[PDB]
């Protein structure tokens, strides 16, 4: 009848464990992001931190190089070695075929080792996801994303966690041509998707915007308190 | 049925239920009917598709210049013997240089199934391969099945609808021995046409026919080079 | 009797069973009114029943023979009104691992091929079709599969 | 309650019963029995026929896995094939090595364990088949051993295996081997082997004859049916 | 096949409905649906018929069919589509 | 009875981590330990599971392991498992020491260890660990870094700690008692002891039952200082005298 | 009561008693066999038997005296079939001490060496547990005769004088005041001690062509098996 | 939940883990072997008793030891044991010629039971049921151990396993109290050994083992009974 | 009840296979069609949400210079067996000096079909369209997980693949050229798809000897659009 | 457990026969119920 699953598939076509597996991402830590012609932003926040512990061991979002950075959720047990797992394909792609590394080469490296994670009785499966945050070569955008079972898909922009398709519905006036025209109303935009999401109090919201090429700097709280006065003044002069 | 799980465990009867299983999906392919005379031998089988359209998968190929074979059920387990028969046959071919009879090489074709079929973690192979070829004596058929028990004859068959080729072959496998190739290979069809049901084809791109002999290299039959062979016909009675 | 217990639904006659072993035991006057019994299958057989008195001559009857299913059937065809030309030799052979009961499905079949029926069966595919339709038919064979 | 699941662990008995389906399935098998003269060992075997089935004289149970030795074997012929080979591959190590003669005892002992440690690990499994094995030779003589699923090496003058090996070994002990000569030792398992198995289960069947000793020359190979009189010799007495 | 469409056959003399409707586009999209998906189907219809305060099905030509795709596979189950080929 | 199946290699069935919930049961069993923020300095505490006196108390420091001149830990948990744990990271510790010649910043050192248990969490059917320890040391960027093990990968690390279970009644004192930039790392000593003779079920803080380990930033040095129940007798004195300061108000 | 695979495995059970290997203690008690090991001052006698069931049994391969060494010998119990593999690894593990060590081994350690591989046949349930029983003799320097048991849970066991196995119970239980005497033992006497311990476990003391009779004395240290000629002198001896 | 599997060790829902549980209580029905720490030397005093009068003590020995200074005892079942003497007997003449000099025992106990915890720890299938008593002499002062299957090793002046193990840690608990005289511990840790023990006591019954700082000497029943019983 | 996935069943017969089956049910239709002149093949991207990207996910790839392909049920699954292929094609061209045919394509991929090993722990429910141009001209061949060949004129797969099949035998026409084929794709595929037709719904895949490759091109679906 | 303090107090007493109890007793009505608690010394140490 049912034997629930271990690696071979269910009567129906599909697993369990893999199905079982997405839960996870939902109950993880949630994350947003936006993309544009040349600057990029995201955002995480979901940090549970009551400022009384560490804050830099609680620091998740990383980058391998300034071009590409690595966006994740879930979990940071088996997300710190996707992080360490992708650094040394990305250094091999820094090492070998010297040019920056493509989005197509490394997704499919940690594709091909997230489908044999899931494989062997054995190595264990993901149960977390990720995200590919970045840009392609001469200020194009990438932005890309991760799956238990090793497939990866691009999006206009990042919405995922609780209410992936209320956010997108949001992102839908977010496909003008005016976001990301400036990146003053792209970051008060991020702010604003964010809003419907979780608590959205400001303390553990953090954002890095990465213009062009340049490396991602996250943003403090002053220019943050900035974007969010902007933000309450085109809200309150919509009236 | 728990104790038909492990192919090590035997049962409390000891028969493995195993082989059976694997003994059905032997029985559930195509209806083949093998054969051999003296002179030559001819072998049978038949082809099904999926849809019309879409070409009637063949069964009869070839190996050893003076080696056909048929196969039926499983395809995985069949080309994986079918490259292992190609590296056997080449054996005594290359060092020996000289081709092997199939008395002494299918025992180890025996023997490679006989793993699987033994220690746990392993599974049996259903084999519809229907063998034949040509030493110093003449001709031989053999058998295989999950089993790993291949048996010399004259005529067998197996698949579906074979109980009924079987009682047709006993009195006519006797006297098949003698004829030449001709009258021998639309005899050979005037067999499985009665298995088959009588109300249909049976037409030519859905039946295999082979012919092997001492002097004469194998040669795969099918499509235009079965139409000599059906032509000339005596058609079933109602 | 199963192994442990309780209880048993029936467990009141599997005593009394027991029982009737008792008075074939200890009770001489039931040596009179032989009585017979019969079972589907021997799976649970209690070994206290070899006796005179007990269960005395136990009969394993196997799958009838392809002769003994050919008789068998003949023998409640014989009222029936039959095409003729029954050779007898392709039912007999068809028949294989069938239970008595299945030849009679094929036997009360082949009374209802009279009038029309509508379907037409003609004439000596008639016995091998009610003998398939238990465990046949294909369909699949390959489809899906090779 | 499961305890008979697995042959390599035990049950609360101090037995396995995988064993016992190993014993019993030999016991399936078709009659075929041993016996050993003074200057050579005779072999035979019944092959049951249903239909045909097939060329007659072929895969036979009659198997040679050395110069001075020979196998009867019963059950399942993939297995038999196996364990013949799995002896040839022993014979092969001896005469490889060393290239003379392998004592019979010896041999049983190389096989024994091989049999044995099949029982030993619940990977692989117990064979369901039993051989014969015998051998003559001018220095050692004849000997007859028999090798039973479980492991156990020992031999006797004779033994039987098959769906009674009862009644198949009560007329040995009145059978006269060592005066009577080889040729006569043949036909004593010719005879009662038609009269026992009665043809009544089986219709047709066919009994294989194999033997070594002296009058061969140490050498192993089938004797037919004709040759040497047996022929006469086996439908003689045999129809009472 | 021709037998879910001969249901709505009969099902036309229920609830309101014309012979303009084309019965075997989503008829094929839904297979194993037997007879009595269907007709809760041709049911919860009227339920949003009611709620949109429409009539006869025909009106409501093409939307007829939009509201028989949403309901019947939302009756079935809910899974995503992304991690099927994934 | 789709969770009852023996595992441990793939992960339970909405999302929640299998056997992390009852790794972190085994936690809280029977474990104690306490963190707190110093500057110049860091201190750490422990206790002696057997409090019986016929004990030689030769093993010097039993919860507290020190694997670096310049840092140490302090297991909680099964003495048994962690001693694999002590020598591994000691020799990981030890081959990049070898390696670079430069002491092995705790940054990358504790997340070893953690990718070396998510390993044995991670597959092969392995055994989770069931200890968390503790990390303090000082490095030439980010200097005093705290850290705590996790079985699940992800490390508890923070600049406090709670050890175990039991201590959850330290962790409501040691947020409302939470200071930046005053040490004096005995006015955490002192609130140590605080936390032992109150939150902590054996009370009057018995000194051959605990241990306190505190280690104080010395260039080079970096003396790991043992106390260890010299002069921890005259702070149960000092405890009490607070003790009986503070009765005096009322 | 049983909870888990504790049936299929040698693992303890609540009450700290293993399974697996429990149901080999009494695996040897369905072998039938009873083979006493007693010592005298100078000479250890060992005494076992055999059952004849059918006339063709022979006295070579089912005698189940097995000699390790020439000065060292050994009986087995139980099943027969794992001793013979036991037999053979004795002989290995001697001529390693033979080999590498360069003198004949005391057969203390022998017993050591064994019953370390039988516990690594203890360790693991795919391997089978081997329920063979050894019992092993030998001379050691200055030590006089020796006797030596090993059952197949795994350890080295000697003493003076110590019997395990199906009826050895009751020979144990008689031999304790019979034994005592404790005095030098002649080679008649401890032959007289073989059989009346014989003669309470069974007293049908039949022709002694059946029973095997081995001793261990220091005259030539070589062990030496005892002839049929001298078996039924000393039993009509002791019997007047 | 279950949940740990095994390799190293199996499961438990609350505490400690199940399964070797059990092979932990065949751990207390092995044989009771007391042990003393006492001055500039270490005793160990343990008890054998055969089945039967046929049996000799002078084959099997209960007491080995792996070096000439540090002998040792077990509490515990039965070749488990006999494994690991052997495995120590590897094991600590390695380490022994490594450094070529003995060394403190402080690093016998780190080295030679960090296998043996190993070996109890990880999956032997089967579980191991045999702990042990450790000792030595080591730079003028001695120590006594005690370690078990769970792999917690111990340190005790006066420690028992086995029998009396509720009644003689208790009795050692409150008779003793720090460190006594040497003689003067032997004697109460004697008296609370012969307190479950039969009341029937022979040379041939117990055996008594001794570190001394000149090095382990293993004694013998017969200067077992000829110095007391009651030995002090 | 007691499924031993490839262990067999009492029955008996394979299970898991006929639910790798069951695996292309789940993915996207797509509807092959060999002809003389060229082969012309379609398939639905099934576009979810605006932010999926239309040329992100495709189900033709192109395994070598003269072969294409249509992949069916899992994505990653197939992509492995493409790209390996693509790695069997190149040693083809390199010790024969000639392409590889697009026939032994699939015994390649055949013999690894079920291996009951490491891959294929649990099998791949991938089935492959191998489409291309060999040396005798425009072919299409269909397989499935359980290692199937058998030459198919049209051949369908996916979920509409059952309705599919029905309406395509009838309309299918195999002596005739591409410029029937052109219009006969888009009769199969306005019937399948229940929304409007754009670029970025479904894309065409059409492999021609003289005309190449083509595979495809941009911006000449919407062309078959207003050609209605 | 006090007020089985109590009555353990109150049987000595009685069994010495005097109308009051001494706080010596109460002293021996704990050592009774102090032989019942948990278990020891196997598993934890």
């Not at chain 2, 040669?219 to 005596?234: A, H, K, N, R, W």
Request: proline share 3%.
């Amino acid at each position: 009848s049912y034997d629930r699953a271990i690696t071979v598939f269910s009567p129906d076509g599909h697993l369990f464990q893999v199905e079982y597996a997405q839960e996870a991402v939902k109950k993880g830590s949630t994350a947003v992001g936006v993309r544009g012609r040349d600057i990029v932003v995201l955002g995480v926040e979901k940090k549970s931190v009551a400022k009384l512990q560490d804050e830099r061991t609680v620091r998740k979002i990383c980058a391998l190089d300034d071009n590409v950075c690595m966006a994740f959720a879930g979990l940071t047990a088996d997300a710190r070695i996707v992080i360490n797992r992708a650094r040394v394909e990305c250094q091999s792609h820094r090492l070998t075929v010297e040019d920056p590394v493509t989005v197509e080469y490394i997704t499919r490296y940690i594709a091909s080792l997230k489908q044999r994670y899931t494989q062997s009785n054995g190595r264990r499966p993901f149960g977390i996801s990720a995200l590919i945050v970045g840009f392609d070569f001469d200020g194009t955008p990438r932005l890309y994303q991760t799956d238990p079972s090793g497939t990866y898909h691009a999006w206009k922009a990042n919405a995922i966690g609780r209410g992936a398709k209320s956010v997108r519905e949001f992102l839908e006036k977010n496909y003008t041509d005016e976001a990301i025209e400036t990146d003053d109303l792209t970051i008060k935009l991020v702010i604003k998707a964010l809003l419907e999401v979780v608590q959205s109090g400001g303390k553990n919201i953090e954002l890095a915007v990465m213009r062009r090429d340049q490396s991602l700097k996250i943003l403090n709280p002053e220019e943050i308190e900035k974007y969010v006065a902007e933000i309450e003044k085109e809200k309150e002069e919509n009236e | 049925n728990q104790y038909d799980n492990d192919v090590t465990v035997w049962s409390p009867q000891g028969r493995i239920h195993q082989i059976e299983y694997a003994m059905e999906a032997v029985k559930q392919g195509s209806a083949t009917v093998g054969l051999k005379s003296k002179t030559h031998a001819v072998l049978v089988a038949l082809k099904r598709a999926q849809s019309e359209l879409a070409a009637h998968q063949k069964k009869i190929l070839h190996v050893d210049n003076h080696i056909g074979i048929s196969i039926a059920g499983l395809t995985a387990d069949a080309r994986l013997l079918c490259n292992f028969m190609r590296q056997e046959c080449l054996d005594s071919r290359f060092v020996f240089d000289r081709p092997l009879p199939v008395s002494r090489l299918v025992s180890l074709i025996g023997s490679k199934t006989q793993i699987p079929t033994q220690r746990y973690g392993r599974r049996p192979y259903g084999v519809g391969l229907l063998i034949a070829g040509y030493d110093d004596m003449g001709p031989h058929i053999f058998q295989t099945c999950p089993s790993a028990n291949y048996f010399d004859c004259r005529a067998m068959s197996i698949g579906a609808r074979s109980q009924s080729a079987r009682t047709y072959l006993e009195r006519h496998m006797s006297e098949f021995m003698e004829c030449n190739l001709n009258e021998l290979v639309k005899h050979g069809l005037r067999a499985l046409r009665e298995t088959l049901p009588a109300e249909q084809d049976l037409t030519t791109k859905n039946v295999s026919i082979g012919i092997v002999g001492k002097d004469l290299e194998f040669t795969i039959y099918d499509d235009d080079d079965v139409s000599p062979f059906l032509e000339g016909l005596e058609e079933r009675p109602q | 009797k199963r192994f442990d217990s309780e209880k048993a639904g029936d467990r009141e006659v599997q005593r009394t069973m027991l029982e009737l072993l008792n008075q074939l035991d200890g009770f001489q006057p039931n040596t009179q009114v032989k009585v017979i019994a019969a079972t589907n299958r021997v799976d649970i057989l209690d070994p206290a029943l070899l006796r005179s008195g007990r269960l005395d001559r136990k009969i394993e009857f196997p799958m009838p023979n392809e002769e003994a299913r050919a008789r068998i059937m003949q023998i409640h065809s014989r009222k029936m009104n039959v095409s003729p030309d029954v050779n007898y030799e392709e039912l007999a052979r068809c028949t294989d691992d069938f239970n008595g009961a299945q030849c009679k499905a094929v036997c009360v079949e082949a009374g209802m091929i009279a009038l029309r029926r509508g379907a037409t069966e003609l004439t000596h595919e008639d016995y091998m079709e009610g003998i398939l339709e238990v465990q046949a038919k294909k369909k699949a064979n390959l489809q899906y599969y090779a | 309650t499961g305890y008979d699941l697995s042959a390599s662990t035990f049950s609360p008995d101090g037995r396995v019963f995988q064993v016992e389906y190993a014993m019993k399935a030999v016991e399936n098998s078709s009659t075929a029995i041993g016996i050993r003269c003074k200057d050579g060992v005779v072999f035979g075997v019944e092959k049951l026929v249903l239909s045909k089935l097939y060329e007659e004289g072929s895969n036979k149970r009659l198997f040679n896995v050395d110069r001075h030795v020979g196998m009867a074997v019963a059950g399942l012929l993939a297995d038999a094939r196996s364990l013949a080979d799995i002896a040839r591959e022993e014979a092969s190590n001896f005469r490889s090595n060393f290239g003379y003669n392998i004592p019979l005892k010896h041999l049983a002992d190389r096989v024994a364990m091989y049999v044995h440690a099949y029982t030993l690990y619940s990977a692989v499994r117990p064979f369901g088949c039993s051989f014969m094995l015998g051998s003559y030779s001018v220095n050692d003589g004849a000997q007859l051993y028999m090798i039973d699923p479980s492991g156990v090496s020992y031999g006797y003058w004779g033994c039987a295996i098959g769906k009674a090996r009862q009644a198949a070994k009560t007329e040995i002990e009145k059978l006269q081997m060592k005066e009577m000569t080889c040729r006569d030792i043949v036909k004593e398992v010719a005879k009662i082997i038609y009269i026992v198995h009665d043809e009544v289960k089986d219709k047709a069947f066919e009994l294989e004859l194999s033997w070594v000793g002296e009058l061969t020359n140490g050498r192993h190979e089938i004797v037919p049916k004709d040759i040497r009189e047996e022929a006469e010799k086996y439908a003689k007495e045999s129809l009472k | 096949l021709e037998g879910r469409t001969h249901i709505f056959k009969i099902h036309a003399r229920s609830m309101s409905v014309e012979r303009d409707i084309r019965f075997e586009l989503l008829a094929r999209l839904c297979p194993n649906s037997t007879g009595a998906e269907i007709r809760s189907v041709c049911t919860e219809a009227g339920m949003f018929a009611i709620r949109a305060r429409r009539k006869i099905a025909t009106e409501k030509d093409f939307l007829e069919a939009v509201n028989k795709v949403i309901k019947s596979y939302a009756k079935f189950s809910a899974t995503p589509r992304y991690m099927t080929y994934n | 009875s789709r969770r009852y199946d023996s595992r441990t290699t793939i992960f339970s069935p909405e999302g929640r981590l299998y056997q992390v919930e009852y790794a972190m049961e085994a936690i809280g069993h029977a474990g104690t330990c306490l963190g707190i923020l110093a500057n110049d300095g860091v201190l750490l505490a422990a206790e002696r599971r057997n409090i019986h006196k016929l004990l030689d108390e030769v093993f010097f420091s039993e919860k507290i392991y020190k694997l670096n001149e310049d840092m140490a830990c302090s297991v909680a948990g099964i003495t048994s498992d962690a001693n694999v744990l002590t020598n591994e990271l000691r020799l990981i510790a030890q081959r990049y020491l070898l390696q670079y010649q430069e002491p092995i910043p705790c940054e990358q050192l504790v997340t070893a260890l953690c990718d070396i248990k998510q390993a044995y969490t991670q597959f092969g059917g392995k055994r989770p660990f069931g200890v968390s320890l503790l990390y303090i040391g000082w490095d030439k960027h980010y200097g005093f870094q705290l850290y705590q093990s996790d079985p699940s990968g992800n490390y508890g690390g923070w600049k406090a700690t709670c050890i175990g279970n039991n201590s959850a009644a330290a962790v409501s004192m040691l947020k409302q008692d939470y200071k930046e930039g005053e040490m004096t790392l005995k006015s955490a000593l002192a609130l140590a002891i605080k936390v032992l003779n109150k939150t902590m079920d054996v009370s009057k803080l018995s000194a051959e039952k605990v241990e306190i380990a505190t280690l104080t930033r010395e260039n080079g040095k970096t003396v790991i200082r043992v106390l260890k129940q010299k002069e921890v007798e005259q702070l149960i004195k000092k405890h009490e005298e607070e003790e009986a300061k503070a009765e005096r108000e009322k | 009561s049983s909870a888990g695979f504790d049936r299929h495995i040698t693992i303890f059970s609540p009450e700290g008693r293993l399974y697996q290997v429990e149901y080999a203690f009494k695996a040897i008690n369905q072998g039938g066999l009873t083979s006493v090991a007693v010592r005298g001052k100078d000479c250890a006698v060992i005494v076992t038997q055999k059952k004849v069931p059918d006339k063709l049994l022979d006295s070579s391969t089912v005698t189940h005296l097995f000699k390790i060494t020439e000065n060292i010998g050994c009986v087995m119990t139980g099943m027969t079939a794992d001793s013979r593999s036991q037999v053979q690894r004795a002989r290995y593990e001697a001529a390693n001490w033979k080999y590498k060590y360069g003198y004949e081994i005391p057969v203390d350690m022998l017993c050591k060496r064994i019953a370390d591989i039988s516990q690594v046949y203890t360790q693991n349930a795919e391997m089978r547990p081997l329920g063979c029983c050894m019992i092993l003799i030998g001379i050691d320097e200055e030590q006089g005769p020796q006797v030596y048991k090993c059952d197949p849970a795994g350890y080295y066991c000697g003493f003076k004088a110590t019997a395990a196995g199906v009826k050895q119970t009751e020979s144990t239980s008689f031999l304790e005041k019979k034994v005592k005497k404790k005095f030098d033992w002649t080679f008649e006497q401890t032959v007289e001690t073989a059989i009346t311990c014989l003669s309470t476990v069974l007293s049908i003391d039949f022709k002694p062509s059946e029973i095997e009779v081995g001793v261990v004395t220091v005259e030539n240290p070589k062990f030496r098996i005892l002839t049929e000629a001298e078996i039924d002198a000393h039993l009509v001896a002791l019997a007047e | 939940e279950r949940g740990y599997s095994f390799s190293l060790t199996t499961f438990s829902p609350s505490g400690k883990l199940v399964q070797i549980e059990y092979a932990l209580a065949a751990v207390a029905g092995g044989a009771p072997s007391v042990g003393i720490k006492a001055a500039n030397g270490v005793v160990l005093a343990t008890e054998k008793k055969q089945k039967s009068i046929l049996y000799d003590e002078r084959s099997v020995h209960k007491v080995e030891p792996i070096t000439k200074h540090i002998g040792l005892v077990y509490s515990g079942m039965g070749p488990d044991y006999r494994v690991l003497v052997h495995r120590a007997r590897k094991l600590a003449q390695q380490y022994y010629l490594v450094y070529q000099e003995p060394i403190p025992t402080a690093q016998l106990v780190q080295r030679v039971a960090s296998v043996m915890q190993e070996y109890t720890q990880s999956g032997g299938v089967r579980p191991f049921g045999v702990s042990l008593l450790i000792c030595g002499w080591n730079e003028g002062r001695p120590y006594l151990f005690q370690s078990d299957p769970s792999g917690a090793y111990f340190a005790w002046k006066a420690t028992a396993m086995g029998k009396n193990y509720v009644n003689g840690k208790t009795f050692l608990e409150k008779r003793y109290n720090e460190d006594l005289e040497l003689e003067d511990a032997i004697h109460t840790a004697i008296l609370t050994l012969k307190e479950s023990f039969e009341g029937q006591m022979t040379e041939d019954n117990i055996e008594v083992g001794i570190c001394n700082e000149a090095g382990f000497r293993r004694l013998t029943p017969t200067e077992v009974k000829d110095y007391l019983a009651a030995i002090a | 009840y007691d499924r031993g996935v490839n262990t067999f069943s009492p029955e008996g017969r394979l299970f898991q296979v006929e639910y790798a089956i069951e695996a292309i049910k789940l993915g996207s239709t797509a509807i092959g069609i060999q002809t003389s002149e060229g082969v012309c093949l379609a398939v639905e991207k099934r576009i979810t949400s605006p932010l999926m990207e239309p040329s992100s996910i495709e189900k033709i790839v192109e395994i070598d210079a003269h072969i294409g392909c249509a992949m069916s049920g899992l994505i990653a699954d197939a992509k492995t067996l493409i790209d390996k292929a693509r790695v069997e094609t190149q040693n083809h061209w390199f010790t024969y000096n000639e392409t590889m045919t697009v026939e032994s394509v699939t015994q390649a991929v055949s013999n690894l079909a079920l291996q009951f090993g490491e891959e294929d722990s649990r099998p791949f429910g991938v089935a492959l369209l191998f489409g291309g141009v060999d040396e005798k001209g425009p072919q299409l061949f269909h397989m499935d997980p359980s290692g199937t060949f058998v030459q198919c004129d049209a051949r369908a797969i996916g979920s509409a693949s059952e309705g599919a099949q029905s309406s395509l035998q009838e309309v299918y026409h195999k002596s005739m050229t591409l410029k029937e084929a052109i219009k006969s794709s888009l009769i199969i595929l306005k019937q399948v798809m229940e929304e409007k037709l754009n670029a970025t719904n479904i894309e065409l895949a059409t492999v021609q000897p003289g005309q190449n490759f083509h595979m495809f091109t941009k911006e000449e679906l919407e062309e078959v659009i207003k050609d209605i | 457990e006090v007020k089985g303090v109590c009555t353990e107090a109150g049987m000595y007493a009685l069994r010495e026969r005097r109308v009051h109890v001494t706080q010596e007793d109460f002293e021996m009505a704990v050592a009774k119920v102090m032989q019942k608690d948990s278990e020891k010394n196997m598993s934890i140490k």
